[PDB]
Amino acid sequence: MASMERFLSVYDEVQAFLLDQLQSKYEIDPNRARYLRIMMDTTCLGGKYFRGMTVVNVAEGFLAVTQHDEATKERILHDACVGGWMIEFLQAHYLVEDDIMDGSVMRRGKPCWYRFPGVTTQCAINDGIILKSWTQIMAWHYFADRPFLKDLLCLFQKVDYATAVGQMYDVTSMCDSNKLDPEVAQPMTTDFAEFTPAIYKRIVKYKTTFYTYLLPLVMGLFVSEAAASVEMNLVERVAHLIGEYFQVQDDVMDCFTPPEQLGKVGTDIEDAKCSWLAVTFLGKANAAQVAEFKANYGDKDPAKVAVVKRLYSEANLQADFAAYEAEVVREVESLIEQLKVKSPTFAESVAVVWEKTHKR
Amino acid sequence: MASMERFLSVYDEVQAFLLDQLQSKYEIDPNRARYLRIMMDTTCLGGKYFRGMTVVNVAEGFLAVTQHDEATKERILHDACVGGWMIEFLQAHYLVEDDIMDGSVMRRGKPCWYRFPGVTTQCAINDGIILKSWTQIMAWHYFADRPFLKDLLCLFQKVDYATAVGQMYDVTSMCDSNKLDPEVAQPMTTDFAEFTPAIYKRIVKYKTTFYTYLLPLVMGLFVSEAAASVEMNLVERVAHLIGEYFQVQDDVMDCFTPPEQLGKVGTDIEDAKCSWLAVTFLGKANAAQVAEFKANYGDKDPAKVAVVKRLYSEANLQADFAAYEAEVVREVESLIEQLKVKSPTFAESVAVVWEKTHKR
Ligand SMILES: O=P(O)(O)C(CNC1CCCCC1)P(=O)(O)O
Ligand SMILES: O=P(O)(O)C(CNC1CCCCC1)P(=O)(O)O
Ligand SMILES: C=C(C)CCOP(=O)(O)OP(=O)(O)O
Ligand SMILES: C=C(C)CCOP(=O)(O)OP(=O)(O)O
Ligand SMILES: [Mg+2]
Ligand SMILES: [Mg+2]
Ligand SMILES: [Mg+2]
Ligand SMILES: [Mg+2]
């Protein structure tokens, strides 16, 4: 604890600064300011703050080994915090816009922002645009005279682009690639020939791992001026693997976790999603199951969903998950040893990250 | 001419570079690459390219007065071009997303991107996100080692934020400020007490002038290293005024220009927009007209629209437009004289801009 309530207080000065800049510069009336205060809180708070705290943890590690003034430690911790929020604000940006795209109902127990009676799709879309816009003013204000700014903005811009690309990958995985046409309406795949592990990993990589694990870990280094004390390739590879597992957990939970516990009602089967469950099923199933899959997958009607959820329990997908989990634990622990070669404290910060995903 | 076909060719290497980066780095299959090629072309091309060419024109002015190598002139012109596209790409970003928000049908004679059979609201939203994402890679690639990068990115980020803010201002102008509540559905204004010129100018300023005139003019200076050769306050003020007029033209045209000539079917009256027409009407009308306005404005039914369009012709709004146009020509020409004090060639580039708005 402690570091979290210190991360939460940094949110408050971000929120204050942004709304002050709006008032004193952007001619905002106290009412619209109020709207944007509630907007922020609803889309940014409520979560575990796990991605943002990751910047704080990596930064916190190096303080133990590195000699800094008291005022220096406080400067680094503060930047890790603004870095933390830059990310959660980038996520809240995507979440808001992803849910409108998907057509979601619940998220963290509460309705999706656009479903708020006095928001509407018309506003939420723009609110999303503002959320990411805010990540930039944070950067330009707080890190105005930091040597890591040009690097950090550049890392941020590319991470963002990666996420947007992966968002396209995700939303187009149910129709056939060769049939993709802006002028022809997109029909659902019948053959499911693009439900491979190679295409699946391609989706997850960009749509999640980059921003959920890469961005936070490297921002931790950036704020701590320790990018020189890691092999960057190594940092890259670990984040793509721990992040892949993160989404694989999501995919399973979706299908097999009560609405109350999940925070939402999962519709990947309805949405014809290219999930871990689907890909792994089709890498296991006999022709008779495959046919009973095609004839029932990607449909809204609960009875068709039952067939799929019934199939998965019989197809024993807890088996391959275990086998996947233990192959991940295998390669994650391998990379941490490799990390200890240049950066022992970063290695154990990555280690802390792994458990914090494995455990949850 | 000439400079335009040179601006269009710079688009081609931007498009090539982006799709190459996607292929060789982002693992894009030739089909999705195709989608994003068509997306770009449809949302970026078709327009007059007037905002982007403005960077080119300002840059072109200084080449006549400033001694540069041949290879230097070509470097500056090229940056003005990538600067030009950064802006048109930022606009195409907003247009795509604005039309989804408003619920539009036509734009430049062709349907709105989301209305394309094989696009859908689900994809277009993300496509919009990518369009602005592309403005950043342009910047980071082409201007990688330019002294104006930190300035230019910072100008871009703030311009963008201004536009998003103004987008909120625009979309919330039909309901009462004190009633704004994320949890209460937004009813339309009955009193229209916020249809003032002071609130109207506040909308237009942020939602248009910043990106349509400010961004292009200053980017022209940035690429030419002549930000030191202008009073920036002066450049600011002129762009907020020529841009205000630009939107005022739009507002009139909307109501009074055939669908064929306009490129779209105007529904500001249906959309209950805070237009120049409405504001100026309520600053002119007697109580009997005002009542026949309230009872007919903000409604979809064509008969109610007829009443409003009928009122405007009788309310003689060509009068106040003339009076506005000649008060604008008045203050625009004033500022150009003031501009000639420090920057004679920029002054005449601003002058070229004014006519290119007045004429069109
Ligand atoms: O949390 P979810 O389940 O809605 C996830 C939504 N994914 C987006 C998260 C934010 C960045 C883009 C992908 P997914 O359906 O992919 O599991
Ligand atoms: O060209 P339009 O008419 O759809 C304009 C849409 N405005 C947006 C343009 C792009 C930036 C945000 C405002 P407006 O309705 O405001 O006249
Ligand atoms: C985006 C996904 C895949 C859901 C988790 O997001 P959260 O934002 O709720 O995660 P925490 O920050 O709460 O850990
Ligand atoms: C955004 C508005 C107010 C409509 C004009 O946009 P365009 O993009 O069509 O303008 P040009 O670049 O064609 O001049
Ligand atoms: Mg989703
Ligand atoms: Mg899911
Ligand atoms: Mg509009
Ligand atoms: Mg209009």
Side-chain angles (χ1 to χ4, degrees), chain B residues 130-151:
Chain B
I130 297 167
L131 270 165
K132 198 206 282 157
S133 264
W134 277 332
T135 64
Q136 299 310 291
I137 313 156
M138 290 179 67
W140 285 101
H141 170 88
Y142 288 100
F143 315 137
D145 48 39
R146 304 283 206 278
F148 54 79
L149 180 79
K150 216 193 94 148
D151 283 333

Side-chain angles (χ1 to χ4, degrees), chain B residues 47-51 88 91 95 107-108 211 246 250:
Chain B
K48 309 169 170 200
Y49 317 113
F50 134 84
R51 299 149 175 79
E88 307 266 306
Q91 184 194 4
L95 296 176
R107 161 94 70 193
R108 305 163 177 172
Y211 98 81
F246 184 89
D250 190 292

Side-chain angles (χ1 to χ4, degrees), chain B residues 270 292 295-296 299-310:
Chain B
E270 291 86 322
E292 201 175 37
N296 296 287
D299 198 287
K300 208 159 51 172
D301 166 20
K304 308 258 195 59
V305 178
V307 179
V308 179
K309 283 180 176 167
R310 189 213 72 188

Side-chain angles (χ1 to χ4, degrees), chain B residues 86-357:
Chain B
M86 269 186 79
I87 312 174
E88 307 266 306
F89 273 60
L90 183 72
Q91 184 194 4
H93 162 84
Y94 277 118
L95 296 176
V96 166
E97 303 279 38
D98 188 68
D99 292 336
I100 294 170
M101 285 161 63
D102 302 331
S104 317
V105 299
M106 297 270 101
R107 161 94 70 193
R108 305 163 177 172
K110 291 176 178 172
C112 291
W113 185 244
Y114 76 100
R115 285 186 80 256
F116 273 58
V119 171
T120 320
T121 296
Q122 190 175 213
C123 289
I125 284 170
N126 194 64
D127 299 346
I129 296 167
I130 297 167
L131 270 165
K132 198 206 282 157
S133 264
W134 277 332
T135 64
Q136 299 310 291
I137 313 156
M138 290 179 67
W140 285 101
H141 170 88
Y142 288 100
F143 315 137
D145 48 39
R146 304 283 206 278
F148 54 79
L149 180 79
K150 216 193 94 148
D151 283 333
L152 184 156
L153 281 168
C154 187
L155 179 87
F156 200 76
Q157 153 47 13
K158 282 169 193 168
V159 160
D160 177 27
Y161 187 62
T163 307
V165 169
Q167 189 75 316
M168 169 192 63
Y169 283 155
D170 188 86
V171 83
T172 56
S173 40
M174 56 286 293
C175 45
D176 290 349
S177 290
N178 58 299
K179 268 55 190 280
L180 283 164
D181 207 343
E183 316 224 60
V184 187
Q186 288 302 285
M188 183 175 64
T189 189
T190 51
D191 43 297
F192 294 87
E194 286 170 51
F195 275 57
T196 61
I199 280 150
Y200 173 73
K201 289 176 189 188
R202 183 232 226 183
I203 292 152
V204 174
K205 195 182 156 195
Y206 294 82
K207 80 157 192 194
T208 329
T209 78
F210 277 85
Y211 98 81
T212 50
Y213 288 92
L214 186 59
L215 188 65
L217 287 161
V218 189
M219 193 141 308
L221 297 159
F222 277 10
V223 300
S224 282
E225 314 278 18
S229 75
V230 294
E231 195 80 55
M232 187 47 67
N233 290 348
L234 233 171
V235 186
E236 231 148 60
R237 290 160 58 188
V238 77
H240 298 307
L241 179 73
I242 311 162
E244 184 191 292
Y245 173 94
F246 184 89
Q247 186 65 56
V248 161
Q249 257 200 298
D250 190 292
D251 284 347
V252 165
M253 290 193 274
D254 180 284
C255 187
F256 288 112
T257 304
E260 292 86 348
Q261 183 52 18
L262 188 41
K264 84 145 101 76
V265 168
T267 55
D268 276 7
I269 308 149
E270 291 86 322
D271 281 56
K273 270 267 200 148
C274 177
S275 71
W276 180 86
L277 305 172
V279 169
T280 319
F281 174 91
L282 300 175
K284 206 180 183 194
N286 64 43
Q289 299 170 268
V290 166
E292 201 175 37
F293 177 81
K294 293 172 179 185
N296 296 287
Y297 197 73
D299 198 287
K300 208 159 51 172
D301 166 20
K304 308 258 195 59
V305 178
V307 179
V308 179
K309 283 180 176 167
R310 189 213 72 188
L311 281 163
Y312 292 166
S313 59
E314 294 154 0
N316 204 37
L317 284 163
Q318 55 222 291
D320 317 72
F321 183 64
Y324 177 77
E325 190 193 46
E327 175 60 13
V328 173
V329 175
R330 208 191 146 88
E331 284 168 316
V332 160
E333 284 183 347
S334 180
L335 292 149
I336 295 159
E337 295 306 300
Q338 292 280 33
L339 282 160
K340 287 164 189 197
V341 191
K342 274 200 178 169
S343 52
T345 336
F346 186 70
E348 211 195 326
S349 294
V350 176
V352 163
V353 158
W354 167 239
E355 191 221 328
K356 278 195 189 184
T357 302

